[PDB]
Amino acid sequence: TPWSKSELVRQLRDLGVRSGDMVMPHVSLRAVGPLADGPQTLVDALIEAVGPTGNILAFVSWRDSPYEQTLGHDAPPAAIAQSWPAFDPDHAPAYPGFGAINEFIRTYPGCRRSAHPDASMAAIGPDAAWLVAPHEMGAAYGPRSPIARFLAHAGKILSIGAGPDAVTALHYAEAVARIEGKRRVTYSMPLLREGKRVWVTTSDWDSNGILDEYAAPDGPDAVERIARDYLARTRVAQGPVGGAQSRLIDAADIVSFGIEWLEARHAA
Numbered sequence: 690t691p692w693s694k695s696e697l698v699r700q701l702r703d704l705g706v707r708s709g710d711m712v713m714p715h716v717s718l719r720a721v722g723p724l725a726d727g728p729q730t731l732v733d734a735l736i737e738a739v740g741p742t743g744n745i746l747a748f749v750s751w752r753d754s755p756y757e758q759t760l761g762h763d764a765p766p767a768a769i770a771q772s773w774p775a776f777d778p779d780h781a782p783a784y785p786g787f788g789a790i791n792e793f794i795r796t797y798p799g800c801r802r803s804a805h806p807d808a809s810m811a812a813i814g815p816d817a818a819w820l821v822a823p824h825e826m827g828a829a830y831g832p833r834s835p836i837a838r839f840l841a842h843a844g845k846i847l848s849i850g851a852g853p854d855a856v857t858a859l860h861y862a863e864a865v866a867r868i869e870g871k872r873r874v875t876y877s878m879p880l881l882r883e884g885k886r887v888w889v890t891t892s893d894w895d896s897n898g899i900l901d902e903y904a905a906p907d908g909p910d911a912v913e914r915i916a917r918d919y920l921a922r923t924r925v926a927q928g929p930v931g932g933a934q935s936r937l938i939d940a941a942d943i944v945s946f947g948i949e950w951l952e953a954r955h956a957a
C-alpha cells in the first residue's frame with residue numbers, strides 16, 4: 690500500500706531529522722516505492738520534517754545544460770552558441786539523472802534557485818536566498834558556492850536509497866584538497882544578464898574525477914571511494930524512508946574526512 694506523508698514524516702523523525710534542520714536529500718524513488726500522491730508526497734514529508742524554520746537544499750542542475758557540448762572548447766561551438774536556450778532559473782527543468790524528485794523540489798512554491806546553470810541548486814526555507822546566492826561560474830561546488838554555505842549551516846545529507854557516489858557535498862573536499870594533479874575542465878554556459886543571453890566560459894574542478902585515477906566514465910570516483918570508507922568507519926543513523934534504506938550524515942564531518950582522505954593519499 691502506498692506510503693502516506695504521515696508515515697514518511699515519522700520515518701524521517703526516527704532517522705534523526707529534527708525541526709529546524711538543514712537537509713540536502715539524494716533520493717532513489719524506485720527504492721522508496723509507491724507514494725500516496727507520487728513524489729510530491731515525499732517532498733511534502735521532507736518540508737514537514739524540517740518544519741517552518743528548517744531548510745532543504747538540492748542539487749538540481751539543468752536538463753539542458755550544454756556541458757558535454759561545450760566541454761574542452763575555449764568558446765561555445767557556433768551552432769550551440771546561436772541556438773541554445775539561456776538558463777532561466779524560473780523555468781529550466783532539473784536534470785533527470787540526479788533524481789526525478791528534483792523537478793518537484795524546484796517547482797515548489799517559494800523555492801529559490803541558484804544561478805549556476807550546470808551546478809544549479811534549489812532551496813526551500815527561510816534561509817533559501819542566503820543559500821543559493823552567490824553561485825558563480827568557476828565556483829560550482831567549492832568555496833563560495835551553496836555547498837560551502839550548507840557546510841557552514843549545520844547541514845545534514847539525507848541519502849534515501851542513494852549510493853555512495855551520490856554525495857555532491859564531497860565535491861567541496863575535492864575542490865579544497867591540497868593535492869597534486871587535480872583535473873580541471875573548461876565549459877560554457879548561457880546565462881541571462883539583464884534579460885539578454887550571455888555566454889560565459891569558465892574552468893573549474895572536474896566533477897567527474899578529481900584525479901586521473903578517479904576519472905573512469907563509470908567510476909568509482911573519489912566521492913564514492915571516500916563515502917564508502919566513511920560509512921564503514923562512522924556511526925550514522927540508518928533506517929527506512931518508504932521502502933528505501935536511508936542514512937542521515939553530518940555534512941561537515943564527511944567533508945572534513947574527505948579532505949583528510951585525499952591529502953593522506955596524494956602528495957601536495
Ligand SMILES: CN[C@@H]1[C@@H](O)[C@@H](O[C@@H]2[C@@H](O)[C@H](O[C@H]3OC(CN)=CC[C@H]3N)[C@@H](N)C[C@H]2N)OC[C@]1(C)O
Pocket residue numbers: 750751754756757784807808854855857896897898904905906907908909910912
Ligand atoms: C547536467 N550536466 C552534468 C554535469 O554536471 C556533470 O555531472 C556530474 C555527474 O556526472 C557526477 O555524477 C556521476 O559520476 C560518475 C563517475 N564520474 C558516474 C555517474 C554519476 N554518479 C556528479 N558526481 C557531479 C556532476 N557535476 O557531468 C555530466 C553532465 C550530464 O554533463
Ligand SMILES: [Mg+2]
Pocket residue numbers: 742815816
Ligand atoms: Mg534559520
